[PDB]
Ligand binder design. Sequence first.
Ligand SMILES: [Ca+2]
Lengths: 207, 557
Amino acid sequence: SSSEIKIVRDEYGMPHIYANDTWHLFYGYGYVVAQDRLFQMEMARRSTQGTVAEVLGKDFVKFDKDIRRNYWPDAIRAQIAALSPEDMSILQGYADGMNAWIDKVNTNPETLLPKQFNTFGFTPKRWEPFDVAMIFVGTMANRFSDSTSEIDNLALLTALKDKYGVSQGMAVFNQLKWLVNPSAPTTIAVQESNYPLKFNQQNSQTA
Amino acid sequence: SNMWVIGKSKAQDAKAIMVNGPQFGWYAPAYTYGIGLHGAGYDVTGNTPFAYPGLVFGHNGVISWGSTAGFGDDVDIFAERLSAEKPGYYLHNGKWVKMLSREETITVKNGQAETFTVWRTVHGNILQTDQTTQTAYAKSRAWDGKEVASLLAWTHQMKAKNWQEWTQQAAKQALTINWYYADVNGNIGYVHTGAYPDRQSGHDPRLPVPGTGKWDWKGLLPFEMNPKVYNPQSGYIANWANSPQKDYPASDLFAFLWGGADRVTEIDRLLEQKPRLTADQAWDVIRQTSRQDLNLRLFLPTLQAATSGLTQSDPRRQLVETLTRWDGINLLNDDGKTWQQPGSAILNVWLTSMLKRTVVAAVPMPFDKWYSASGYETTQDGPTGSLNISVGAKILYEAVQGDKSPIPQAVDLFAGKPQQEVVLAALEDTWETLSKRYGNNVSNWKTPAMALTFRANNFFGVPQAAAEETRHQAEYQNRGTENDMIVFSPTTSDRPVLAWDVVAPGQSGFIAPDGTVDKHYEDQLKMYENFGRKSLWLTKQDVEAHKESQEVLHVQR
Ligand SMILES: [Ca+2]
């Protein structure tokens, strides 16, 4: 009963997991994911860790380098090691559930191996907590929450000061890339609140 | 990515309605994964990108949640001082400090492996180095060290039963993400979550800071500073990647701005049209915003003022009359290829001409190309994500607002000419361009419609399916990759919650070795195209009543 996991799929195939502790719940989630989306997940793993060229060849080398250059994997592993047992059970259970299905796939590939592994010429390997963490970390953090263009911005500012002079060039930068614009529509109305901080807008860090 | 949360004072026949349209592009198999979790303190249903442990889109029968990207400025670049005398060191707080480094080998199918080194300082990994000026740039993320905490905050928030419980987990989510709340009592809420740096005085966050120590961040701002609202007096919360709050600064990306021209206004117009919205009206905001030309509202007044004294036979006036008669909603002709009205093509040609004559001409090359796009750029497979108002168009909108704009026009983008002259010249270009292609009878112009593609390559450009699994839809729709709606305390049901979503092409990406696709490989594609939706089940009885199959596993850790 502590060992029991019930999986129910609805009429669109959506799975519902029933279990009695954290590890077992996330194990059922990992299991259904490996049934439904194993190739997609494997390629997301490779995308998030920069191991695509291993299977797809030379056209993905620069890609892989760029992914590895943008994170510090040992730091992610240190955050995992600091987790409480309860938190670790989410990641561990998920990995363990995917592996239960991957092991079934690799034992009877003639009927269970997604066709794309045969097309692309490789077979799936097991997962660990770090890999599950990196699906999130490599999508939501390292790509989606990682946006800056400050080096390009400085090159535009330098070009604007060369064209217009130091003062007008800074002011034209403030016209093209304003720090804040009070007419911007805001999700929170001004009657509710406003942000209390005011920022330097003339590159005073190098003044 | 968009979201509209309608609270008790704005909802019809319900206490709250949440409608989310996260925009990640379109892929085969689906970007998100449908999942319900029941036990160990959880009782949830919804869908989530890449099957993360935490559901980004879903509800637990008490509260519901969703997200849109935040685009706050949580990343700064530090310019590290190097020395040719001490390779691998940088100057920090008066001392030469050793960089951390690691070696990586890229193994290559049918090729030779390549080894390279990644370098890191107290401010983050090195992006690039200039040997000539002995400077290395390090990228500093306010969320560095909190990535795993952010994943777990997104999981534990699924158990919250009230605003205070849910904001306790929002305070632990460190990435720049807008989070949204609604509940059975009709409360609604919003938090622009994440870690943001407490910067030294004088630090302009759009440009790099020295890495020698005096410009280091003081620490992180407290959660009290994150923009947030609970039960706003407007009765709703709307977002389409627009600013959270007055005086809050955007991402430092040059192509990203929060200004007077913002596509979220299209959602506000629909939410304010009628006093209250039913769930069906709230869902129909997806279809209308999906088809809405975003530039017509911005520029039609400028085009009408410029052409007001022209004769009836002037083609520059006739192009504007054609736009004035239009509401900017695009619809396909029966051919499934062309749009019923030619207004988006007229706007694209005119705006492209206007930007070339104004913002592009004021900016030095090669930076001028950052400001030339009209926003109607795409491909035969159609847009790779949402459509927006371009950065050049947002800067042109401030120029054409004259003294209504709060932005000093340090350079006159019209170069001393009357704005009407330049507007009319771009209209003459537009008539020449379009009449040579389509002829002089505007009423028969059948301009190309944009289409939509579920790509077999993921957003990284990496195959996640074979090329023949790419799926096509005739109508491009500027909407969520998935859409989900949660309705609390409906008066038309006794259930405390009702919820729906759409996960296209389908739940399953499985194809057996012999080529046989799974029964759920493509069963949500037509529902996506037609603005349909399926029910999200939560209770044991509703799940059982709609069961197709079940498995029982017996496992020991
Ligand atoms: Ca910045």
